Design a protein around this nucleic acid. Structure first.
Lengths: 101, 180, 116
DNA sequence: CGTTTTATATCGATCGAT
DNA sequence: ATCGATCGATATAAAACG
């Protein structure tokens, strides 16, 4: 009964893992508490991106690799144009989960 | 006739002779998709020759999209080679082409309903369902999809020669119902 | 660089701290430690420099195969994936992406890549 | 039964778009 | 509400198989 954990691999999620690990190594918290924070994070990111996101970007390029396993799509786009709101990107890994249960 | 149908698709089967963990294949092969909930096989594609393979847990697979007998065997060998490279005792066995599809263009229009009424026992035409006329040829046993445009689809062949013989046989009747 | 991303990040850290305050108390860990987590979390974020924060002034083959501040990575949800021949079209939503040390967040993303 | 390929073509759609 | 548009059938052969 939870949310996807892919977001822990993002910049903000990875920073949280860092902060969480320093407190664990300092013995300021237990690893279990750290894991519980990560699981709350998963929820909060999913809700924050759903309710406080407005931008709509688009990616155009050559699909170098694709993959679909366990209800997860992975794409490696090379030599593409990412337009936000235009960005040139040599390589871009896209990992996505199902919007449905 | 002066025209030679173009082979557009060849379906072949290959027994790799060894059980497979589809979940593992999907994990180590690139361009692979595995969704057992809808199909109990791993779908994998390669670029040379541009084809798509259906790999099963039984170790057997189907290779589609090939445009020549050679590309089909060649592509089949690459898929088997990947399965091996992943870690299975896969072998290239029982290669066999199961279906060849070809298309043509006689260049002229065709009065389909006249062709259907004339060859009622072989053709089924009902634009409501499908715009093309379905001609079920007896010898060779090839199914043709005849369109008003002059475009011809021939399928059901196991030898590329059957597509050719099927087209030669139908050309006279196609010509007979040419809109002119 | 990106206002939206900045906003989303700040909302996430403040929101996560509120959601776990109850678990810290339940674990015997005091409020200062929770705050410490927020602080270290904030510092780390600033160190990455993927966008600017309101607290920044305080911190003056055929087989599968990388991941770091230099990997351009998009993590998100998918509405529908479809391909015709070698032309793929991906409708994405609620995602975040790091492109050349800069972060962006999106409501919707449209992908059009050709597998060739 | 579902999935894949592929040529071919027509009839509703929803479809951003007037 | 209306466009050119792309979208999901519709039809064909055939194998794999849970």
């Amino acid at each position: 009964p939870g949310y996807y954990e892919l977001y822990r691999r993002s910049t903000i999620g990875n920073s949280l893992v860092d902060a969480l690990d320093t407190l664990i190594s300092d013995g300021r918290i237990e690893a279990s508490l750290a894991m519980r924070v990560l699981e709350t994070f998963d929820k909060v990111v999913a809700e924050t991106l759903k309710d406080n996101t407005q931008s709509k970007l688009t990616v155009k390029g050559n699909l170098d690799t694709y993959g679909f396993c366990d209800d997860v799509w992975t794409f490696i786009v090379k030599n593409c144009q990412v337009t936000v709101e235009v960005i040139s990107v040599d390589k871009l890994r896209i990992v996505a989960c199902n919007s449905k249960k | 006739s002066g025209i030679v149908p173009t082979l557009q698709n060849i379906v072949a089967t290959v027994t790799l002779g060894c059980r497979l963990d589809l979940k593992t294949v999907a994990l180590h092969a690139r361009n692979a998709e595995y969704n057992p909930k809808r199909f109990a096989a791993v779908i994998m594609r390669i670029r040379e020759p541009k084809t798509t393979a259906l790999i099963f847990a039984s170790g057997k697979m189907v290779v589609t999209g090939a445009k020549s007998e050679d590309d089909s065997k060649l592509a089949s060998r690459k898929y088997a080679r990947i399965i091996q490279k992943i870690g299975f005792a896969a072998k290239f066995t029982d290669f066999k082409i199961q279906n060849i599809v070809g298309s043509c263009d006689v260049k002229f229009p065709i009065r389909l309903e006249g062709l259907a009424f004339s060859h009622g026992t072989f053709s089924s035409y009902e634009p409501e369902l499908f715009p093309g006329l379905i001609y079920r040829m007896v010898k060779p046993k090839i199914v043709l999809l005849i369109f008003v445009s002059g475009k011809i689809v021939l399928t059901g062949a196991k030898q590329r020669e059957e597509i050719y013989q099927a087209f030669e046989a139908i050309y006279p009747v196609l010509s007979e119902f040419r809109k002119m | 660089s990106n206002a939206e991303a900045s906003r989303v990040y700040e909302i996430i850290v403040e929101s996560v701290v509120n959601e776990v305050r109850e678990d810290f108390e339940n674990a015997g860990i005091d409020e200062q430690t929770l705050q410490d987590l927020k602080n270290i979390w904030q510092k780390k974020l600033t160190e990455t420099k993927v966008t600017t924060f309101s607290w920044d002034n305080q911190f003056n083959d055929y087989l599968i195969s990388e991941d770091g501040p230099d990997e351009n990575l998009m993590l998100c949800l998918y509405d529908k994936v479809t391909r015709t021949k070698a032309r793929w079209k991906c409708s994405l939503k609620d995602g975040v992406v790091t492109i050349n040390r800069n972060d962006y967040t999106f409501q919707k993303a449209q992908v059009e890549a050709e597998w060739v």
